[PDB]
Write a protein that binds this ligand. Structure first.
Ligand SMILES: *[C@@H]1O[C@H](CO)[C@@H](O[C@@H]2O[C@H](CO)[C@@H](O[C@@H]3O[C@H](CO)[C@@H](O)[C@H](O[C@H]4O[C@H](CO)[C@@H](O)[C@H](O)[C@@H]4O[C@H]4O[C@H](CO)[C@@H](O)[C@H](O)[C@@H]4O)[C@@H]3O)[C@H](O)[C@H]2NC(C)=O)[C@H](O)[C@H]1NC(C)=O
Lengths: 261, 96, 96, 48, 1396
C-alpha cells in the first residue's frame, strides 16, 4: 500500500501541481485545491487573490516564479530519461529571485519484464526467516534422512510421504555398491537400503599459495599418480610422485613442496 | 446487469433452440414445450444400453446444441476375436 | 478501550490529572503541499505511550503532558518577524 | 445489564455546534438545510 | 420490512447432483416470478444451471427449482473450483451468496470375495457405484492396491454400465508383504469420492471349528479383581456344538493395546474339558497378581489382561485358538456420553436426556444405574434446582433415559450425570456435566416442534404425524408455517401448514417415503413481522426411519432343507419387487474365522449412506442461523439473519474344496432361478445378494446353507511343509450316525511324498455321535503342489478326500534388491536409459531350489508446476532501449538473444495475435543483426572492448563468449573466432592461485557488468563470470588447453569461495561451479552455505529470496540494491536449476514472478538477462522431468517380457514375474521424464554350506517325558587359533505345549563351571546367552521335557544361534520331539525313502 501511495502521490502531483495556474499577482505563491487556484499573498499585499498593495510596497515591479515540467524525454545512451522546467512562470523580472530547486531531473529507464497477475501482499517485518521452527510432521511421513559417508540425496524435501522413496548418490571419487534407495515406512522410519560408496577416483588436494604440484587431471583413477613440483631450482618437502590408496594418498597438505623458487 | 430487480424485467426467455436431437436406443432424460438459450439437457439410453461419452448437451447462444458425440452401447458382451479360431459352442451375436 | 475491557488492579497511571500541550493535535494533522493547508488527523497526539513525560511552560503554569509522538517540545517566546512601516504627508497652502 | 454496561468514555460532550457541520446546503439559495450526516457517531472510541 | 423472502439450499453443493432449492415469499398479494440460478465465481460469467418459478396465492407463494453444476462445465485447471454463486432474480428482489461446492458425489462400496487371502491367490473385487441421488452412477472408476507398507502396487480401470463394476482378478505379487493391504477407489472423472476397503494377506488354512471367548464384562475392576468369569464356547462350521475338547487357558500381563511382548503367569495356566459345546472358566485375578505379578494392589493398574485359549478336539486332532487381547484392568470403568440429546431447550415440551456407558475395548455396558442432577436459570440470573433422579441402562439398547419437565421461563439449564452402582468409590465413579440454552429469539417469537426425538424408527410409508406450535407475540401474522424434509444432503419434500380458527395449525402429516430410509431430518420455519421489523423463526428434529430397501431383493435356495450334502445340485431363487441387477457371492463361514472379529463385507451399508447428511446432531440450535446450519442447510433472506456468521466443527454428536464361489452378476426380471453344485466342503455356505437398481442399493438377508453327511473324514493338512522334513498329517473320522460302525481310512500319494506305511488299516471301531483320531506320516521329498487322496472305503458310500499339499525349501529366505533410475536426458548426471540386471547365482543355495525375481516400476511424477511468463511487454524487451555510444547498442542487443531463447524453449508464440511462423522468422532477423553487432565490438587480437580506442576487457571478452555460447545452440558463428577469443583469454589472463584479473577499464559500464565484490577479492566475481562465459562457450570449441584452464579455475574458485564473503559472491561462484562436477565434495558444501543464506515468507516457504548486503530501504523505483537482489537470486535459482530440483525452485520462481522490488531489476543487462534465463531454464526443467516413458523389458539372450507405458495419466506398473533364467535388459525410448525400476531377488540358503554359520549345530531327542541333548562347535578363520566364539544368543525352540524342566535348567546357571550367563522363555522359545564356544570340540548340553500336547500338526523346532558380538553370524537347524521313521538319504538332489 505504501508503494501504491508513492505512485499515487506522483500522479496526483502531475495532475494538481500549482505550476499550471496563471501567475498570482504581486508575488503571491499559487495554491491549487483540485478545482481552483488561490493566491497565498506576501505580507503587505491584500484583496481576494493578492491584487492590491499597501502604500509601503517599495520593490513593486519585482517578479519571479517556476513553471511546469516538460513530459519525459526518451532515454539516453545510459538508459536514463530526463525532464526539465524553464522557470518562466513568469521569468524573474527587475531583480526578483532566482527560481529555487533543480531545473532538471534524471531517472533510470526501468520497465516491467514479467506478466501482471495482481499485486501480492507484502508486510515490512515478515520476510525475515532464514532458519525456522519445525512444522508438526502431522503427515506421519519421514523427514529427510542422514545419507551415508560420502553421501548425497538426489532430490530434497523437508518430509517425504508414507511409502515414498529417495535415491542416495556417491561423491565423484566413488560408486554405489548395494541398493541405493531408502523408503518411508508407515511410522517415520526409512528402510535404509544396504549400500556403501566404493572409491574408484581421487582429486587434486588443497595446497599453499605457491602451487607445489602439477595438476595433470580433474580426477585420478586409483592406481594412477599425481606429482608435487617446484616452479624453478629447489626442493623442500613431500613425495615427488604419489599413487592413490582407496583412501586419499595421505598427501602433504599442512605444507607442500614450498621450494626456494 | 448489476441491479436487475431495479428495472422492468423479462424473466421469460425470448430466444430458444430447436428441439434437441434424438439418439439411437436413447432419449433426453427431461422434456419441455420449449428449450431456452443456455439450458442444459441430458441424454440417457433405454434399458439394456449404456451411454458412452459425456451425456451433457447445452443450447448455445448460436441457437444450436453443443454436444459430446455420445454413443448408446448395448449392455452385452460381444464375442472377442477368437484367440486361435477355437470353437465357442453357444455361438450368438451378443452375450447378456 | 479494548486494552481495558476487563482488568484487575490496573498499573499506575501518572498521578495528577494533566492537560495536553496547547494545540497539540495540529502537530499531528497532515498538510497538503499543493493546496497549502491542513487536511486530516494523521498522527494521534492524544496517545500517552504508557509514560509520564511532562513539560513546564512557566513556574506559573500547571505541567503539560507530552504525547509519545513528540521528541522535544519547548515554550520559549520569540518574535521571528516584526515589521512597522509608517509614512506621513502634510501639505498646507495659503493664497491672498 | 448494569455489569455488562461500561463507561465508553470519560465525557459525553461534543464540540459546541458540531450538528451544524452535518447539515445540507442549497447552492442556489445559499441556505443551510436539514441534517444529512450523523455528526455524533462515536464508533466505540473515546476521541477527546 | 413488510415484504420478505427465504431461499433455502444445501450447506455445500455437490457437483453432478440434482440439488433442490426451495423459495418462499411473504407479504405479496399479486403473483410474480423468480429465476433461482447457479453462476460461476467470482466472475458470474457462466450460468451452470437456472430454473424459473412462479409465485402466486395458488402456490401459497412457495416453490422449488432443481439445479445442478454439470461436472464438465467447471473450468477445471491445476487447483479445482471451491466456490460458486447461488443467485435469485425477481421483480421486487435479487441477491446472491457464495456457496461452497464439493467433488464428493455418490458412493463407492468396494466388495471383496473374501476378507482374507493367501499368496498364490487373487482378489475378485467389485464396486457398487451409486450417485448422490442413489441411482447407478455409470462413471469410469479406477481402483488402486496399496501394500501393507503403504507403497502403491497397481491401478486398474473399468467403465460402469450397471452401477456394478467388476475388475480384473488382481493376483497377489509373487512375494508379498503380509498384512492389511488396502483398496482405494476413485472416479477418473471430475469427482473425489474415495471409497476404501481392506483385506489381509496371510499364510492360513481355514479353521475346522469356531472358538469364542466371552467375558462377563470387557474390564476387570473392584467388582471382580478377587475373581472374574469367562465363557469358552465352540461349534463346528456345520452348525453343531463340539462334543468333547481339552481346553488350555493362559493369562498375560499386557501394558498397551497397540502392542507388546510382555510376560504371563507360568502358574494359573488353567486346564479343563469343554463338553457339549462349552467350558466355564474363572480367573482369581488377585491371586495370580499378588503371587506372581510385580503388582500387589488394584490401584497399581490402568493396564491390560490378555487371555488366550487353545481348544483341542479331544479325540479329533484339530486344534483351534483364540484370544481376547486387552481386557483392561480399570479403576473408573464407566465413561459416559449423551445420545440423541439436542442441548437446546424448550418450555412445556419435555427435555429428554439419554446417556450411554462404555467399557475399555468397548461395548454399551447396559446393566448399570445412573443418576442425574439439574439446575435451572430463568429471569435476571434467577435459579431453581431440581430433585435428583435415577435411571437404569437397557441391557440391549445400552442407553439409560431420563425425562424432565421445566418452568415455563427456563432460559438455561445445566445438568450433571454420574454413574450409580455398588462398586463405586464415588471419587472414582464416572460423571459428566452439560449445558443447554433456549432458542434466543430477538423478537421472542418461537416455533417448537412437539415431537419426542425418538431413537426408535418410523416404519416406511407410515403417516408421520408431528404437531408444531408457533408461540409468538405476533400470531395474528403467522397464517402458516413451512417445512422441509431433508434426506442425505437434499431437500426431498417441502410444504406449508395453515392456521385453524382455534389458533392451532395443520400437523406435519406425511408418509415416510422410500427416499428417507437411512434417516431424515425435519426443519420447520416462518418469517413474522412486528410493526416494521421481521424475524426468521425455525426449529429442526432428526427422524430415525426403518432400514428397508426399495428393490426388496430376497434370496432363498428353493429346495428348502435342514441340510444339503456334498456335491449336491441345488437351485437358488432371486425375487425382487422391481426389475433389478443382482450380484452374488458365496463364502465358507470358516473364512470369517481367520480374521479375528471381521465384518460382513457389506456390513452397515445404510450407515455409510447416512454420512451424506450435511447437518449434524439431533436438532435444535442457539438461533435461526444455528438451526439451519446444524440441519445442513444455508439460506438467503432479507429477514435479518445470515448463517455466514457460523463455521463448521468436525462433528461428533451421535444418534473340490473352495474358500469362495458364486461370484456372479445377473439381471433378475422380478424372478430368476440359478442352478449349481454345492461343493464337497462340509461347512456352512453364506450366500450374500446385493441388488442394484433405480431405487438404490439393497443387501438381502444372508442365506445360510449347511453341507453335511452322517459320516465323513476331515484332515488337518498344514499350509506348507519343509522339503525333506517328515511330518504327521492328522485328522478325524466323524460319525453322526446314532449307531457305531467300523471304518477305515487309506492315503494315496504321488512318488514325491513318501511314507513308512508302504501301501489296510485297523478297520477301527467308532461310536455314534462321536469321532476318532486319524494319523498319517509322510516326508515331502519334492517341492511344489501335490495331490494326496485320503479315502474312507466304508459303509454309507465311497468317500474320497481330493486334497493337495504345498512344499517349500529347507533354508532361510534372504531377499536381495536391485534397481536404477531410468533417465533418458541425464537430469541426474549422465544419461542412462538401459540397465542389464545379472542372473547371478550365490554359493549357499538349497540344493534343487529355483531362484525367483520380481520387477516393478515407479513413475516419479513432477509435482506442482508454477506459472511464470513474460507479458506482451516482452515486445519492449526485444524492441530495446536504443543503439548508442559506449555500446548502448551492446546493452540493446543482449536482451534479444535471451528473449529468443525464452520464446523458443517455451514455444511461447501466440502471445501475439500474429502467425507464429511469421513472428519466429521476423525475430530471427533481428537476432542475426545482433550477431553482427556483437561481433563489431571485437579486436583483431580476438579481445573485445567497450570502445575501439578502448583497451582490452576480459569482462566483455567473457561476456561476449557467454552470449555467443547461448546463440550457437540455435544459430551459428564461426568456431575459429570463438576459439581464438577463448585462447586469447586463456593465454593472456589465466593466472595461478587465482584467475582472470581485469585490465583496469576507464569505467565499469554504468548499467552493465554489476556492482563488483569491490574492496578486495573481486577475483571471485571475475573468476565466476569468466568461468561462466567459458562453460557456455566450451561446447562450441572443446580444446585441451581451455579445459586445463578450467581444471585450474574451477579448483581455485572452490578453494577460495569458502569463507562466506557477501552472498552475491557465493551465489555467482556457486552458479559457476554448478556447471562443473555437481558431485565434487566442496561444491555441495558451497551449495549448502548458499541455502543457509536464504530468506522466506510462509509457514513452509511460500516465497524464497536472497539478500547479500542487507540494504534495508524500500524502492518503488528499483535502485541498484534491487539489482544485487535480482542478480544474486537469479544465480541461486540457476544453481538450484542446475541441480534439477523443482521442490527447492518453486518458491524462488514465485519470488521472481512478482512486483516485489519492482521492474526488470535496475534494468541492467546483467540482472534482466539472468532473470529471463531463470524463466527459461525453469521451463526446461518442467518439461525435462515430465513423465512419458515406454520402458521395454527383455531378457538378454531370451525374448521380451513386458512394456510399461509410463504416463502422466498413470504413474505405476504392477510387478511382472521375471520367470526366465537369464540376464534382464530394461530399456526405453527417448520420450520425456524420469522414473525408477526395482527388481527383488528371493533365494533360500543353507546353514552348513554358507558363511552365515560360525557355530555348527546338532541335536538329539531320547526317552531316557523325554530328554534332549544339543551338540555344537565353533570354527575360526585359517590364520587364527582355537580361542573360541564371541558372546552368543542361543535358541532352543520347542513344539507348543511341550515345556522344559526349568528347575533342572537352573543347574546351567548355578554350576561352578559356568558357561551361560542367563536364560529366558519368549514367544514359547527357550533363549540362553553364552559367553564363548569351543572350536576344539562339540560343546554338548542336555535338558528334559514334559508335554501338555497342544496341536494336531507340530511345526519343526529350530535349534539356532547368533553371535551377540557379531549379530549377522546366524546359524539354524530344524528338529522335532517326535521319532522319525520315513528315511533314506543319497549323494544327489532327490532321493528314495525307507521305513526305518
Ligand atoms: C487321487 O484320486 C483321484 C480321484 O480323482 C484320482 O483321480 C482320478 O484318476 C484317474 C486315473 O488317473 C482318472 O481316470 C481317468 O478318467 C477319465 C475320465 O475323465 C477316463 O476316461 C480315463 O479312462 C481312460 O484312461 C484309462 C487309463 O487311465 C484307460 O484304461 C481307459 O480305457 C481310458 O483310455 C481312453 O481315454 C483316454 C483319455 O481319458 C485316452 O487317452 C486313451 O487313449 C483312451 O482313449 C480314466 O478313467 C480320473 O479322471 C481321476 N479323477 C477324476 C475322475 O476326476 C487320482 O488319480 C488319485 N491320485 C492319486 C495317485 O492319489
Amino acid at each position: 500500500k505504501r508503494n501504491n501511495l508513492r505512485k499515487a502521490l506522483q500522479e496526483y502531483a502531475a495532475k494538481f501541481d500549482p505550476c499550471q495556474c496563471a501567475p498570482c499577482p504581486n508575488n503571491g505563491r499559487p495554491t491549487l485545491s483540485g478545482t481552483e487556484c488561490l493566491c497565498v499573498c506576501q505580507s503587505g499585499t491584500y484583496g481576494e487573490n493578492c491584487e492590491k498593495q499597501s502604500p509601503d510596497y517599495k520593490s513593486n515591479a519585482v517578479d519571479g516564479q517556476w513553471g511546469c515540467w516538460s513530459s519525459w524525454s526518451t532515454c539516453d545512451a545510459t538508459y536514463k530519461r530526463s525532464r526539465t522546467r524553464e522557470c518562466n512562470n513568469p521569468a524573474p523580472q527587475r531583480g526578483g529571485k532566482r527560481c529555487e530547486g533543480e531545473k532538471r531531473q534524471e531517472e533510470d529507464c526501468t520497465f516491467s519484464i514479467m506478466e501482471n497477475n495482481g499485486q501480492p501482499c507484502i508486510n515490512d517485518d515478515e520476510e525475515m526467516k532464514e532458519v525456522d521452527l519445525p512444522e508438526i510432521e502431522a503427515d506421519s511421513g519421514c523427514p529427510q534422512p542422514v545419507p551415508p559417508e560420502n553421501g548425497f540425496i538426489r532430490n530434497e524435501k523437508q518430509l517425504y510421504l508414507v511409502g515414498e522413496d529417495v535415491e542416495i548418490s556417491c561423491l565423484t571419487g566413488f560408486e554405489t555398491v548395494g541398493y541405493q534407495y531408502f523408503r518411508c515406512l508407515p511410522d517415520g522410519t526409512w528402510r535404509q537400503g544396504d549400500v556403501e560408496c566404493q572409491r574408484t577416483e581421487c582429486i587434486k588436494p588443497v595446497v599453499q599459495e605457491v602451487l607445489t604440484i602439477t595438476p595433470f587431471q580433474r580426477l585420478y583413477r586409483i592406481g594412477e599418480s599425481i606429482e608435487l613440483t617446484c616452479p624453478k631450482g629447489f626442493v623442500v618437502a613431500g613425495p615427488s610422485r604419489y599413487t592413490c590408496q582407496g583412501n586419499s594418498w595421505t598427501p602433504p597438505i599442512s605444507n607442500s613442496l614450498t621450494c626456494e623458487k | 446487469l448489476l441491479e436487475p430487480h431495479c428495472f422492468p424485467l423479462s424473466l421469460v426467455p425470448t430466444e430458444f433452440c430447436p428441439s434437441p436431437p434424438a439418439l439411437k436406443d436413447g432419449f433426453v432424460q427431461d422434456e419441455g414445450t420449449m428449450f431456452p438459450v443456455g439450458k442444459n439437457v441430458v441424454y440417457t439410453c433405454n434399458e439394456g444400453y449404456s451411454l458412452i461419452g459425456n451425456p451433457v448437451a447445452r443450447c448455445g447462444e448460436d441457437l444450436r446444441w453443443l454436444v459430446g458425440e455420445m454413443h448408446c452401447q448395448k449392455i452385452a458382451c460381444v464375442l472377442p476375436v477368437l484367440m486361435d479360431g477355437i470353437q465357442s459352442h453357444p455361438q450368438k451375436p451378443f452375450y447378456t | 478501550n479494548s486494552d481495558e475491557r476487563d482488568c484487575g488492579r490496573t498499573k499506575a497511571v501518572c498521578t495528577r490529572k494533566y492537560n495536553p500541550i496547547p494545540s497539540v493535535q495540529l502537530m499531528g494533522n497532515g498538510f497538503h503541499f499543493l493546496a497549502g493547508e491542513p487536511r486530516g488527523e494523521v498522527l494521534d497526539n492524544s496517545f500517552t505511550g504508557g509514560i509520564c513525560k511532562t513539560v513546564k511552560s512557566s513556574r506559573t503554569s500547571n505541567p503539560y503532558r507530552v504525547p509519545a509522538n513528540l521528541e522535544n517540545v519547548g515554550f520559549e517566546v520569540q518574535t521571528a518577524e516584526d515589521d512597522l512601516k509608517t509614512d506621513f504627508y502634510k501639505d498646507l497652502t495659503s493664497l491672498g | 445489564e448494569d455489569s455488562e454496561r461500561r463507561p465508553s468514555c470519560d465525557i459525553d460532550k461534543p464540540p459546541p455546534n458540531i450538528e451544524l457541520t452535518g447539515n445540507g446546503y442549497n447552492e442556489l439559495t445559499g441556505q443551510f438545510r436539514n441534517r444529512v450526516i450523523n455528526t455524533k457517531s462515536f464508533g466505540g472510541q473515546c476521541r477527546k | 420490512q413488510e415484504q420478505t423472502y427465504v431461499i433455502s439450499a444445501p450447506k455445500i453443493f455437490r457437483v453432478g447432483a440434482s440439488e433442490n432449492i426451495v423459495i418462499q415469499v411473504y407479504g405479496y398479494t399479486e403473483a410474480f416470478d423468480a429465476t433461482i440460478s447457479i453462476k460461476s465465481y467470482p466472475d458470474k460469467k457462466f450460468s451452470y444451471s437456472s430454473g424459473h418459478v412462479h409465485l402466486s396465492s395458488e402456490n401459497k407463494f412457495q416453490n422449488s427449482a432443481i439445479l445442478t453444476i454439470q461436472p464438465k462445465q467447471l473450468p477445471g485447471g491445476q487447483n479445482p473450483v471451491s466456490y460458486v454463486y447461488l443467485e435469485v432474480v425477481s421483480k421486487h428482489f435479487s441477491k446472491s451468496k457464495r456457496m461452497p461446492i464439493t467433488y464428493d458425489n455418490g458412493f463407492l462400496f468396494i466388495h471383496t470375495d473374501k476378507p482374507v487371502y493367501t499368496p498364490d491367490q487373487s482378489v475378485k473385487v467389485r464396486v457398487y457405484s451409486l450417485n448422490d441421488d442413489l441411482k447407478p452412477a455409470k462413471r469410469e472408476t479406477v481402483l488402486t492396491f496399496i501394500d501393507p507398507e503403504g507403497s502403491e502396487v497397481d491401478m486398474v480401470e473399468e467403465i460402469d454400465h450397471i452401477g456394478i463394476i467388476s475388475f480384473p482378478d488382481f493376483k497377489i505379487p509373487s512375494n508379498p508383504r503380509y498384512g492389511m493391504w488396502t483398496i482405494k477407489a476413485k472416479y477418473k472423472e471430475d469427482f473425489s469420492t474415495t471409497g476404501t476397503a481392506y483385506f489381509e494377506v496371510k499364510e492360513y488354512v481355514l479353521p475346522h471349528f469356531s472358538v469364542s471367548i466371552e467375558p462377563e464384562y470387557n474390564f476387570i475392576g473392584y467388582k471382580n479383581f478377587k475373581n472374574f468369569e469367562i465363557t469358552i464356547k465352540a461349534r463346528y462350521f456345520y452348525n453343531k456344538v463340539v462334543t468333547e475338547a481339552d481346553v488350555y487357558i493362559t493369562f498375560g500381563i499386557r501394558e498397551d493395546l497397540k502392542d507388546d511382548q510382555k510376560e504371563m503367569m507360568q502358574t494359573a495356566m488353567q486346564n479343563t474339558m469343554l463338553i457339549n459345546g462349552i467350558a466355564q472358566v474363572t480367573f482369581d485375578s488377585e491371586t495370580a497378581v499378588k503371587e506372581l505379578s510385580y503388582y500387589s494392589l488394584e490401584d497399581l493398574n490402568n493396564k491390560y489382561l490378555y487371555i488366550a485359549v487353545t481348544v483341542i478336539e479331544s479325540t479329533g486332532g484339530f486344534s483351534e485358538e483364540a484370544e481376547i487381547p486387552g481386557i483392561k484392568y480399570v479403576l473408573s470403568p464407566y465413561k459416559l456420553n449423551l445420545v440423541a440429546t439436542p442441548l437446546f431447550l424448550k418450555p412445556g415440551i419435555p427435555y429428554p436426556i439419554k446417556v450411554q456407558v462404555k467399557d475399555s475395548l468397548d461395548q454399551l455396558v447396559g446393566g448399570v444405574p445412573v443418576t442425574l442432577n439439574a439446575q435451572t436459570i430463568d429471569v435476571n440470573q434467577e435459579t431453581s434446582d431440581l430433585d435428583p433422579s435415577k435411571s437404569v441402562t437397557r441391557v440391549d439398547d445400552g442407553v439409560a433415559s431420563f425425562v424432565l419437565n421445566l418452568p415455563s421461563g427456563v432460559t438455561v439449564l445445566e445438568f450433571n450425570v454420574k454413574t450409580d452402582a455398588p462398586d463405586l468409590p464415588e471419587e472414582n465413579q464416572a460423571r459428566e456435566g452439560y449445558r443447554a440454552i433456549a432458542y434466543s429469539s430477538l423478537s421472542q417469537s418461537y416455533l417448537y416442534i412437539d415431537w419426542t426425538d425418538n431413537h426408535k424408527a418410523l416404519l416406511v410409508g407410515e403417516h408421520l404425524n408431528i404437531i408444531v406450535t408457533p408461540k409468538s407475540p405476533y400470531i395474528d401474522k403467522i397464517t402458516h408455517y413451512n417445512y422441509l424434509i431433508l434426506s442425505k444432503g437434499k431437500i426431498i419434500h417441502f410444504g406449508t401448514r395453515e392456521k385453524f380458527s382455534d389458533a392451532s395449525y395443520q400437523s406435519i402429516n406425511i408418509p415416510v417415503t422410500q427416499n428417507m430410509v437411512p434417516s431424515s431430518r425435519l426443519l420447520v420455519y416462518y418469517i413474522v413481522t412486528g410493526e416494521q421489523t421481521a424475524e426468521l423463526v425455525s426449529d429442526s428434529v432428526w427422524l430415525n426411519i426403518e432400514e428397508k430397501c426399495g428393490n426388496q431383493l430376497q434370496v432363498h435356495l428353493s429346495p428348502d432343507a435342514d441340510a444339503y450334502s456334498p456335491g449336491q445340485t441345488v437351485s437358488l431363487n432371486m425375487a425382487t419387487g422391481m426389475d433389478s441387477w443382482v450380484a452374488l457371492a458365496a463364502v465358507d463361514s470358516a473364512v470369517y474365522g481367520v480374521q479375528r472379529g471381521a465384518k460382513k463385507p457389506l456390513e452397515r451399508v445404510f450407515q455409510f449412506l447416512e454420512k451424506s447428511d450435511l447437518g449434524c446432531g439431533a436438532g435444535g440450535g442457539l438461533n435461526n442461523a444455528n438451526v439451519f446450519h446444524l440441519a445442513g442447510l444455508t439460506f438467503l433472506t432479507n429477514a435479518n439473519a445470515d448463517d455466514s456468521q457460523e463455521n463448521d466443527e468436525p462433528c461428533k454428536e451421535i444418534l473340490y474344496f473352495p474358500e469362495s464361489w458364486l461370484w456372479e452378476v445377473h439381471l433378475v426380471p422380478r424372478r430368476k432361478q440359478l442352478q449349481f453344485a454345492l461343493p464337497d466342503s462340509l461347512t456352512t455356505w453364506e450366500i450374500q445378494g446385493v441388488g442394484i437398481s433405480n431405487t438404490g442399493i439393497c443387501v438381502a438377508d444372508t442365506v445360510k446353507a449347511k453341507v453335511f453327511k452322517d459320516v465323513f473324514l476331515e484332515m488337518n493338512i498344514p499350509y506348507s511343509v519343509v522339503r525333506g522334513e517328515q511330518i504327521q498329517l492328522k485328522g478325524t473320522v466323524y460319525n453322526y450316525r446314532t449307531s457305531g460302525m467300523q471304518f477305515c481310512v487309506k492315503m494315496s500319494a504321488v512318488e514325491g511324498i513318501c511314507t513308512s506305511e508302504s501301501p489296510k488299516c485297523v478297520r477301527q471301531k467308532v461310536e455314534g455321535s462321536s469321532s476318532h483320531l486319524v494319523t498319517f506320516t509322510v516326508l515331502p521329498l519334492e517341492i511344489g503342489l501335490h495331490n494326496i487322496n485320503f479315502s474312507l472305503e466304508t459303509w454309507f458310500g465311497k468317500e474320497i478326500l481330493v486334497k493337495t499339499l504345498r512344499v517349500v525349501p529347507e533354508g532361510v529366505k534372504r531377499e536381495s534388491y536391485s534397481g536404477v533410475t531410468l533417465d533418458p536426458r541425464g537430469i541426474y548426471g549422465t544419461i542412462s536409459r538401459r540397465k542389464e540386471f545379472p542372473y547371478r547365482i550365490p554359493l549357499d543355495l538349497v540344493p534343487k531350489t529355483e531362484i525367483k525375481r520380481i520387477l516393478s516400476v515407479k513413475g516419479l511424477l513432477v509435482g506442482e508446476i508454477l506459472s511464470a511468463v513474460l507479458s506482451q511487454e516482452g515486445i519492449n524487451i526485444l524492441t530495446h532501449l536504443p543503439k548508442g555510444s559506449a555500446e548502448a547498442e551492446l546493452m540493446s542487443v543482449v536482451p534479444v538473444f535471451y528473449v529468443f531463447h525464452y520464446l523458443e524453449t517455451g514455444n511461447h508464440w501466440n502471445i501475439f495475435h500474429s502467425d507464429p511462423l511469421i513472428e519466429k522468422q521476423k525475430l530471427k532477423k533481428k537476432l542475426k543483426e545482433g550477431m553482427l553487432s556483437i561481433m563489431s565490438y571485437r579486436n583483431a587480437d580476438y579481445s573485445y572492448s567497450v570502445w575501439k580506442g578502448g583497451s582490452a576487457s576480459t569482462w566483455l571478452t567473457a561476456f561476449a563468449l557467454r552470449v555467443l555460447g547461448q546463440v550457437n545452440k540455435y544459430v551459428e558463428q564461426n568456431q575459429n573466432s570463438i576459439c581464438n577469443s577463448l585462447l586469447w583469454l586463456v593465454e593472456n589472463y589465466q593466472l595461478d592461485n587465482g584467475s582472470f584479473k581485469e585490465n583496469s577499464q576507464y569505467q565499469p559500464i554504468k548499467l552493465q557488468g554489476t556492482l563488483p565484490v569491490e574492496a578486495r577479492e573481486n577475483s571471485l566475481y571475475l573468476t565466476a563470470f569468466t568461468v561462466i562465459g567459458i562453460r557456455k562457450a566450451f561446447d562450441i570449441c572443446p580444446l585441451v588447453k581451455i579445459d586445463t584452464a578450467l581444471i585450474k579455475a574451477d579448483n581455485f574458485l572452490l578453494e577460495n569461495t569458502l569463507p562466506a564473503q557477501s552472498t552475491f559472491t557465493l551465489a555467482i561462484s556457486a552458479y559457476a561451479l554448478s556447471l562443473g562436477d555437481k558431485t565434487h565434495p566442496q561444491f555441495r558444501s558451497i551449495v549448502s552455505a548458499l541455502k543457509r543464506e536464504a530468506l522466506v515468507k510462509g509457514n513452509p516457504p511460500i516465497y524464497r529470496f536472497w539478500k547479500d548486503n542487507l540494504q534495508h530501504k524500500d524502492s518503488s523505483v528499483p535502485n541498484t540494491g534491487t539489482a544485487r537482489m535480482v542478480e544474486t537470486t537469479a544465480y541461486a535459482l540457476l544453481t538450484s536449476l542446475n541441480l534439477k530440483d523443482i521442490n527447492y525452485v518453486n518458491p524462488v520462481i514465485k519470488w521472481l514472478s512478482e512486483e516485489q522490488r519492482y521492474g526488470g531489476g535496475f534494468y541492467s543487462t546483467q540482472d534482466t538477462i539472468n532473470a529471463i534465463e531463470g524463466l527459461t531454464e525453469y521451463s526446461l526443467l518442467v518439461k525435462q522431468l515430465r513423465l512419458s516413458m515406454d520402458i521395454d523389458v527383455s531378457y538378454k539372450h531370451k525374448g521380451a517380457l513386458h512394456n510399461y507405458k509410463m504416463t502422466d495419466k498413470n504413474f505405476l506398473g504392477r510387478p511382472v514375474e521375471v520367470l526366465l533364467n537369464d540376464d534382464l535388459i530394461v530399456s526405453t525410448g527417448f520420450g520425456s521424464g524420469l522414473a525408477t525400476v526395482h527388481v527383488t531377488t528371493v533365494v533360500h540358503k543353507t546353514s552348513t554350506s554358507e558363511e552365515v554359520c560360525s557355530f555348527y549345530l546338532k541335536i538329539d531327542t531320547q526317552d531316557i517325558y523325554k530328554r534332549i541333548v544339543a551338540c555344537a562347535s565353533y570354527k575360526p578363520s585359517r590364520e587364527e587359533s582355537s580361542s573360541g566364539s564371541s558372546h552368543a544368543v542361543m535358541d532352543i525352540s520347542l513344539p507348543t505345549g511341550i515345556s522344559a524342566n526349568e528347575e533342572d535348567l537352573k543347574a546351567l546357571v548355578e554350576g561352578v563351571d559356568q558357561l551361560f550367563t542367563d536364560y529366558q522363555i519368549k514367544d514359547g522359545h527357550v533363549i540362553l546367552q553364552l559367553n564363548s564356544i569351543p572350536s576344539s570340540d562339540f560343546l554338548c548340553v542336555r535338558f528334559r521335557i514334559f508335554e501338555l500336547f497342544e496341536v494336531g500338526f507340530l511345526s519343526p523346532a529350530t535349534f539356532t544361534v547368533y553371535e551377540y558380538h557379531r549379530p549377522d553370524k546366524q546359524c539354524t537347524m530344524f528338529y522335532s520331539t517326535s521319532n522319525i521313521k520315513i528315511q533314506k538319504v543319497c549323494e544327489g538332489a532327490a532321493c528314495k525313502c525307507v521305513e526305518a
